[PDB]
Design a protein around this ligand. Structure first.
Ligand code: T27
Ligand code: MG
Lengths: 556, 415
């Protein structure tokens, strides 16, 4: 016989202070027992399990499950209790490749490594924790006791230990053959290359020879599976990729659960189908989690669905990554906090697409949202391709310069160019840095009684213009915004406004162009119509003239 | 040659921090660095029974052509036992901040000469990711004291005092302070003599070494000339209504820091409902109050003391045109240091690079003055900071930070 290198075992421990499982074996039918005894005799003949004596105090339940539509039984060892007690492992699939970062391949062969899948040795000191018992016929003898010698399917550590063991085996082959790629998924090896199929099939044979060094045999009759591969919800082809078919159902009535399924499919589709939208369809799941409740579809959601159906009418494919070319990312504003993007290298050949949704917040503006979309695309691109794409953005260079230079926060977006495709992101207003000569000065104030919720808002100006409005169902903060609104409404095109409201100043200094508060939205609409606005803050209750006067008027 | 036993704090598992996305160039750099470190025995590959992780990346230190590995041990440092087996601490040298020149040396490579306790090594696990996760990340752990871990200078301290015993008695007026991987060396000599003694010092550790990749560098500070920012009021011949409003606003703010500040007489100049741009003559009760406030503002703040048991907090404001102001404090309105920068280099079109350089300079000042790093309140969205700061980082330590999302009114007053 040819000596084979043994696979070093991974040392395994229970979580600190825990003992192994001691779970009672369910009684089984005479029929199931005989099936389990034969199953285990074969497994024992192959070395996967060994009989043990009654010393071992651990136990895990074993079951016999009928393969649907067959006389054959199947053995199921239920490791749920041992898994709770087994240490955590390093999981290496804490991240799956995205197809858009893959490289085009001339050939991809699949090799079956199922016979190593069930042949990696288990740490000798841990085997005792895997003990199980086949019950005896009529319970008149001791059950037959076994423990595992190899990684058991369904045990918490098996996928991580199997993958780390196969990786270690493959590492020198991959290192000395940099003209191929190897990827392990379940019990298959996928080997791709750009080699002429002769050389490619040579490497495949050399890989089979390399695997034999560990006694890992691979089937001769070449694998059933060929390109295209169905994998992780995608279709992988030699030179393009797509998501598996997305078919949106027809329904007269939509439950909560159908709406969740629909949004999930749309989100999946949005990585290659450009322009997918889900805002209005997601708005219907707001708050409620009664998974069988039927919801009427707003005209808005009906329109979104219609748009999406058109986008999904015919198949769309992505191309693979060419590392010799720049990556370009183009972003469009879609409305209602929705943004969409495409990443490509050649015009009209996307690598992938995607979308970004406005964060939940009280106030916002387009420039902040575009900025966040850029950071998210940047980070996703680092993951997929290891580099930042060049951006094509619907915002003028002068607009960005004005924004970043005057914004109170530090902010930055990487190398980008203006793309003139409406709707453009713009600054809807900018406050003055200095008081305006010749513009009327409005001293504004508001106050409310917290008990009654009654209040007043108003202003007095240097021209003697004055207004006070009585208000109901209001708060101090709302009346301070109302006062600013009244000053904007009643002034000319240029105006100086003096407030003592730290709250209003905090909002306006954030430069919103849209708010959840309809009062803030009205202020924004007034600001957009002005030519010049200077907003000045003073401390309250300091006898500041004009301020003190309207404070008395409104707090009465 | 023998390992000091090290433990985590009680009821505390090892770090399990997720590796952040790395660019292709940083990955390739880390693969080269770690291949060599593994050959030299400093790190070893680990298996899946080790579930711990600490992030890693790579930097190019100030003025260099070579990548440096930087492990972000912030989480492991929080979870590692405190170190007062031999030393309750190294009482921080108050003379360091008074020297005319301080040079900062990267001496972290010396730590690679001491083995790490075999039972603690697992907690130093890290991963070199692969682009698009196409191949399994390369997993390693340290066999020797790692750079950036708080235990490393502690365990190496006995070694380090012995190496510099000669240089210290030969130069008894030089202050030497070690923080993490840095050695701070302060002299009052002229900079040419200073540079010589620094190179003198480098030779001791080259000799003891028998090669350190970044020992030859020197970051030169002159804490002698470090400037502060008292509160100052405008001196004007004509005051508009707007000017006086801003003055009363600033003085009201200052009165939270300085008790005896008054605004009553200044407020009385406002009273009418006047145009903002109208010039107001100062009455004399107002001029006197203003002069009294000016003199109050020339004195130090009352009851300001440093407490080594409390965190230092650093706040930063963007002032525009490349200018940044900052304050270091432990209690609100009790500033231990204030300051202002403008020379943010190589960043006139990049706010985030400028902020990152400010953070590093403030941290350096904090280390020199108190021997610890502050917690930053950063005027930036978390997603923007987290995407970019590692591109501009050149220090071998990393402080803690949080994010300010509401605009501070007080930015005006530090301007
Ligand atoms: C991640 C991955 C999944 C599968 C397969 C999973 C399946 N199931 C197969 C392979 C070979 C890989 N690994 C890589 C790595 C780099 N480029 C590529 N390009 C590439 C891969 C597949 C096809 C196909 N045709 C075309 C190009 N694949
Ligand atoms: Mg008031």
């Amino acid at each position: 016989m040819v000596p084979i290198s043994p696979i070093e075992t991974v040392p395994v421990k229970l979580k600190p202070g825990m003992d192994g499982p001691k779970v009672k074996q369910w009684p089984l039918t005479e029929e199931k027992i005989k099936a389990l005894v034969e199953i285990c005799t074969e497994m024992e003949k192959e070395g996967k399990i060994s009989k043990i004596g009654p010393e071992n105090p651990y136990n895990t339940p074993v079951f016999a499950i009928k393969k649907k539509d067959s006389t054959k039984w199947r053995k199921l060892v239920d490791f749920r209790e041992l898994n709770k007690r087994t240490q955590d492992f390093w999981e290496v699939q804490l991240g799956i490749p995205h197809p858009a970062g893959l490289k085009k391949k001339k050939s991809v062969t699949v090799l079956d490594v199922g016979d190593a899948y069930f042949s990696v040795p288990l740490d000798e000191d841990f085997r005792k924790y895997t003990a199980f018992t086949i019950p005896s016929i009529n319970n008149e003898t001791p059950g037959i006791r076994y423990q595992y010698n190899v990684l058991p399917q369904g045990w918490k550590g098996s996928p991580a230990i199997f993958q780390s063991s196969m990786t270690k085996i493959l590492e020198p082959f991959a290192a000395q053959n940099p003209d191929i790629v190897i990827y392990q998924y379940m019990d298959d090896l996928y080997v791709g290359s750009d080699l002429e199929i002769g050389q490619h099939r040579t490497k495949i044979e050399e890989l089979r020879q390399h695997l034999l060094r560990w006694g890992l045999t691979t089937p001769d009759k070449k694998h059933q599976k060929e390109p295209p591969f169905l994998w992780m919800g995608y279709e992988l082809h030699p030179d393009k990729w797509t998501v598996q078919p997305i078919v949106l159902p027809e329904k007269d009535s939509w439950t909560v659960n159908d709406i969740q399924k629909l949004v999930g499919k749309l989100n999946w589709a949005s990585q290659i189908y450009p322009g997918i939208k889900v805002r209005q369809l997601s708005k219907l799941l707001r708050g409620t989690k009664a998974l069988t409740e039927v919801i009427p579809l707003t005209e808005e959601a009906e329109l979104e669905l219609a748009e999406n159906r058109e986008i999904l009418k015919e198949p769309v494919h992505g191309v693979y990554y060419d590392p010799s070319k720049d990556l370009i990312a183009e972003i469009q504003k879609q409305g209602q906090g929705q943004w969409t993007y495409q990443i490509y290298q050649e015009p009209f050949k996307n690598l992938k697409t995607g979308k970004y949704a406005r964060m939940r917040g009280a106030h916002t503006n387009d420039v902040k949202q575009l900025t966040e979309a850029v950071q998210k695309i940047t980070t996703e691109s680092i993951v997929i391709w290891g580099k930042t794409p060049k951006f094509k953005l619907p915002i003028q260079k002068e607009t960005w310069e004005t924004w970043w230079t005057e914004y109170w926060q530090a902010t930055w977006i990487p190398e980008w160019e203006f793309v003139n495709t409406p709707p453009l992101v713009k600054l809807w207003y900018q406050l003055e840095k200095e008081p305006i000569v010749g513009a009327e000065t409005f001293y504004v104030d508001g106050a409310a009684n917290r008990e009654t919720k009654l209040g007043k808002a108003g202003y007095v100006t240097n021209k003697g213009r004055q207004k006070v409005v009585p208000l109901t169902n209001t708060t101090n903060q709302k009346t301070e915004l109302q006062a600013i609104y009244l000053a904007l409404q009643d002034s000319g095109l240029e105006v100086n406004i003096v407030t003592d409201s730290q709250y209003a100043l905090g909002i306006i200094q954030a430069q919103p162009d849209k708010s959840e508060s309809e009062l803030v939205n009205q202020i924004i609409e007034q600001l957009i119509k002005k030519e010049k606005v200077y907003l000045a803050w003073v401390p309250a209750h300091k006898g500041i003239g004009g301020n003190e006067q309207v404070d008395k008027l409104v707090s009465a | 040659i023998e390992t000091v036993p090290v433990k985590l704090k009680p009821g505390m598992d090892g770090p399990k921090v997720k590796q952040w996305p790395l660019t292709e160039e940083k990955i390739k750099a880390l693969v080269e660095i770690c291949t060599e470190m593994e050959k030299e025995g400093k790190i070893s590959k680990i298996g899946p029974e080790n579930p711990y992780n600490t992030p890693v990346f790579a930097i190019k230190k100030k003025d260099s052509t070579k990548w440096r590995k930087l492990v972000d041990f912030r989480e492991l440092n929080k979870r590692t036992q405190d170190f007062w087996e031999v030393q309750l601490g190294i009482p921080h040298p108050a003379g360091l901040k008074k020297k005319k020149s301080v040079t900062v040396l990267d001496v972290g490579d010396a730590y690679f000469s001491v083995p790490l306790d075999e039972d603690f090594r697992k907690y130093t696990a890290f991963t070199i990711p692969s682009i698009n996760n196409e191949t399994p990340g390369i997993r390693y752990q340290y066999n020797v004291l790692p750079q950036g871990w708080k235990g490393s200078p502690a365990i190496f301290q006995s070694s380090m005092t012995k190496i510099l015993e000669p240089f210290k008695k030969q130069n008894p007026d030089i202050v030497i302070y070690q923080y993490m991987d840095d050695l701070y060396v302060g002299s009052d000599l002229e900079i040419g003599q200073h540079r010589t003694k620094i190179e003198e010092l480098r030779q001791h550790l080259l000799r003891w070494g028998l090669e350190p990749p970044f020992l030859w560098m020197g970051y030169e500070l002159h804490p002698d000339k470090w400037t502060v920012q008292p509160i100052v009021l405008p001196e004007k011949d004509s005051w508009t209504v707007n000017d006086i409003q801003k003055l009363v606003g600033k003085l009201n703010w200052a009165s939270q820091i300085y008790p005896g500040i008054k605004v009553r007489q200044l407020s009385k100049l406002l009273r009418g409902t006047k145009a903002l741009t109208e010039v107001i003559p100062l009455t004399e009760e107002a001029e006197l109050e203003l002069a009294e406030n000016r003199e109050i503002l020339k004195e130090p703040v009352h009851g300001v003391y440093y407490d080594p048991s409390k965190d230092l907090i650093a706040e930063i404001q963007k002032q525009g045109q490349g200018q940044w102001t900052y304050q270091i404090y432990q209690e609100p309105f009790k500033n231990l240091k204030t300051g202002k920068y403008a020379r943010m280099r190589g960043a006139h079109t990049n706010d985030v690079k400028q902020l990152t350089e400010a953070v590093q300079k403030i941290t350096t000042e904090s280390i020199v003055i108190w021997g610890k790093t502050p917690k930053f309140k950063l005027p930036i969205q978390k997603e923007t900071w987290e995407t970019w700061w590692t591109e501009y980082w050149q220090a071998t330590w990393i402080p803690e930070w949080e994010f300010v999302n509401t605009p501070p009114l007080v930015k005006l007053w530090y301007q």
